[PDB]
Amino acid sequence: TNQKPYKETYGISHITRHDMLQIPEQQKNEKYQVPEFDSSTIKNISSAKGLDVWASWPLQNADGTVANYHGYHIVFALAGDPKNADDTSIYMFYQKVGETSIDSWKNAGRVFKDSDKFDANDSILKDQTQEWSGSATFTSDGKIRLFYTDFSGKHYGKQTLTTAQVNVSASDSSLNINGVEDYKSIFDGDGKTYQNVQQFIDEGNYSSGDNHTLRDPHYVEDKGHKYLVFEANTGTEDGYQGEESLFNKAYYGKSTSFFRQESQKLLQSDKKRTAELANGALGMIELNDDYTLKKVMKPLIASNTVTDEIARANVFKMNGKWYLFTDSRGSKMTIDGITSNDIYMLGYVSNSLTGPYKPLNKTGLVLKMDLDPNDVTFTYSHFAVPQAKGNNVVITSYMTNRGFYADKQSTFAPSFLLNIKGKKTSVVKDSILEQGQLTV
Ligand SMILES: OC[C@H]1O[C@@](CO)(OC[C@H]2O[C@@](CO)(OC[C@H]3O[C@@](CO)(OC[C@H]4O[C@@](CO)(OC[C@H]5O[C@@](CO)(OC[C@H]6O[C@](O)(CO)[C@@H](O)[C@@H]6O)[C@@H](O)[C@@H]5O)[C@@H](O)[C@@H]4O)[C@@H](O)[C@@H]3O)[C@@H](O)[C@@H]2O)[C@@H](O)[C@@H]1O
Ligand SMILES: OC[C@H]1O[C@@](CO)(OC[C@H]2O[C@@](CO)(OC[C@H]3O[C@@](CO)(OC[C@H]4O[C@@](CO)(OC[C@H]5O[C@@](CO)(OC[C@H]6O[C@](O)(CO)[C@@H](O)[C@@H]6O)[C@@H](O)[C@@H]5O)[C@@H](O)[C@@H]4O)[C@@H](O)[C@@H]3O)[C@@H](O)[C@@H]2O)[C@@H](O)[C@@H]1O
Ligand SMILES: [Br-]
Ligand SMILES: [Br-]
Ligand SMILES: [Br-]
Ligand SMILES: [Br-]
Ligand SMILES: [Br-]
Ligand SMILES: [Br-]
Ligand SMILES: [Ca+2]
């Protein structure tokens, strides 16, 4: 055949088959394992009575550290009725700084009223059916600036990175959401750098096996420049999905001998098409000072052949280096030895915000969680929260799968600590914090 191998990095970093195949052995080390949690201590968020509360994010200062909003910490979370998976709205919870109990989290309610997306006179928001995850920054002039994912069940799962300013009143006692403003779509994918939903739709959408994503926008600043880093998929010009992508050695790793081995297995494997379709990416755009789209930038990293889904993009500068993280499910990967119970947080390090990134702990493995989904202390959506001092970050996550238990809802997991040193990380032994704790 005249279809020959090649190597093209497209100028971006890559999560490779070589590195992923080392994780099943490496993940046996307790250094990379989410700690065992004691279910006897776990409570529902009492101020969110009856709602599942899952993927969540703190209001952050520009540097990623947790914001002090007039004496409060603020966390945005997705929540809704456990009996309806399509009930997904963003709620704002808060706690006085210094409190750490689960029962210190108060609930200011939903950020958005039903009419907000229609009052915005933004044509994409008119079609929103769910509010998916994001980030929130506390601006120089004291404003709460939210980014999140507008999901549209009406348009085959379209996902649009979206922003609003949340106007909140204080009261000694409680915080109040008075309304939102500057509510607008920012980016729905350009087709060339980031897949757009029209490519999903026209290739056959749900019956194609493709997984289109454009979500989880994370706000970050470098030198006054404003950016979103987000979960996406590559487009036509930066290593698109398809049979051809199986012939790019940059997706396999450094050795040509590993490449010919692994590629022939993959090409004749039951997971060939899944790997062809797999083209996840952590994308990056620059914003203008009014939070509109200024510049589409190339992905920080891509996961061609390995998975279509690298979620909850997170990036921050810590002690001189940039750390980039993403969550990913073993159930959607194509890597032998990685099982449908494996769940990971993967992590990468660079001297600059824009790359290039190198895998942490050699493989990119940072955290592994492999509890049965029915386990009450199952956790997902791990998220590294930068701290003002030291080498440790706080890992938040949600606990208990949505809708599984009548009386134990998805809740804030016990936080725990992750030590980050140069290119290596370690779960800090016996570092379990309160449920939902953001700071040490
Ligand atoms: O309180 C939450 C509760 O309300 C629902 C809406 O029923 O969620 C509304 C909440 O969701 C948010 C999030 O941003 O706004 C969603 C916005 O999008 C719309 C639609 O434009 O809602 C979509 C959700 O509603 C559902 C079903 O309730 O679909 C409506 C949608 O489905 C279609 C297609 O089949 O129709 C039909 C179905 O409905 C009946 O008429 C029953 O009444 C049947 O005859 C018929 O079989 C389509 O015609 C129609 O447009 C659901 O699939 C979607 O997720 C907005 O109305 C809404 O603002 C919140 O802002 C908002 O509070 C619900 O999901 C949830 O349980
Ligand atoms: O909660 C969001 C939050 O979670 C994070 C992680 O923290 O990750 C995403 C998480 O969400 C999951 C699943 O819950 O993965 C998402 C991926 O699954 C897809 C589909 O593969 O989306 C699911 C949503 O789309 C909906 C429908 O709008 O379901 C699609 C689903 O329904 C089927 C039938 O079951 O078809 C329905 C569809 O078919 C038609 O009839 C044809 O027209 C339509 O009328 C109708 O809409 C099925 O064929 C199809 O698979 C919605 O109900 C579902 O919720 C992907 O689009 C999506 O990428 C987790 O696995 C994952 O961790 C974070 O990233 C995020 O912010
Ligand atoms: Br409302
Ligand atoms: Br929906
Ligand atoms: Br195309
Ligand atoms: Br192709
Ligand atoms: Br193809
Ligand atoms: Br129960
Ligand atoms: Ca894909």
Residue numbers in the entry: 32 to 471
What does the paper behind this entry write?
In this work, we present the crystal structure of an inactive double-site mutant of SacB (D86A/E342A) in complex with levan-type hexasaccharides, which are intermediate products in the synthesis of LMW levans from sucrose. The crystal asymmetric unit contains two molecules of SacB, chains A and B, each including residues 32 to 471. Each chain contains a hepta-coordinated Ca2+ ion, water molecules, and bromide ions in different sites, which are from the crystallization condition and two oligosaccharide molecules. Although the enzyme was cocrystallized with an octasaccharide, only the electronic densities of six fructose units bound by β2-6 glycosidic bonds were observable at the active site of both SacB molecules (oligosaccharide binding site 1, OB1 site). The levanhexaose molecule is oriented with its nonreducing end at the interior of the active site pocket and its reducing end protruding out of the central pocket. The levanhexaose is bound to the enzyme by 32 hydrogen bonds with the residues in the catalytic pocket, 12 to the side chains, 1 to the backbone, and the rest of the interactions with 11 residues through water molecules. In the SacB-levanhexaose structure, the oligosaccharide is used as a ligand, despite not being a donor substrate, and it is placed with its nonreducing end in an identical orientation to the fructosyl unit of sucrose and raffinose in their respective crystal structures, which allows us to define the −1, +1, +2, +3, and +4 subsites, beginning with the fructose unit inside the active site (−1) and ending with the fructose unit (+4) that extends toward the solvent. In this way, it can be established that the side chains of D117 and F182 participate in the +3 subsite, the former through a hydrogen bond with fructosyl 4 and the latter through a hydrophobic interaction. In the next subsite, the +4 subsite, residue Y237 forms CH/π stacking interactions with the fifth fructose unit of the ligand. Of interest, Y411, R360, and K363 show a different conformation in chain B, with the position of Y411 being similar to that of the apo SacB structure, while R360 and K363 shift their positions by 6.0 and 4.5 Å, respectively, away from their positions in chain A.
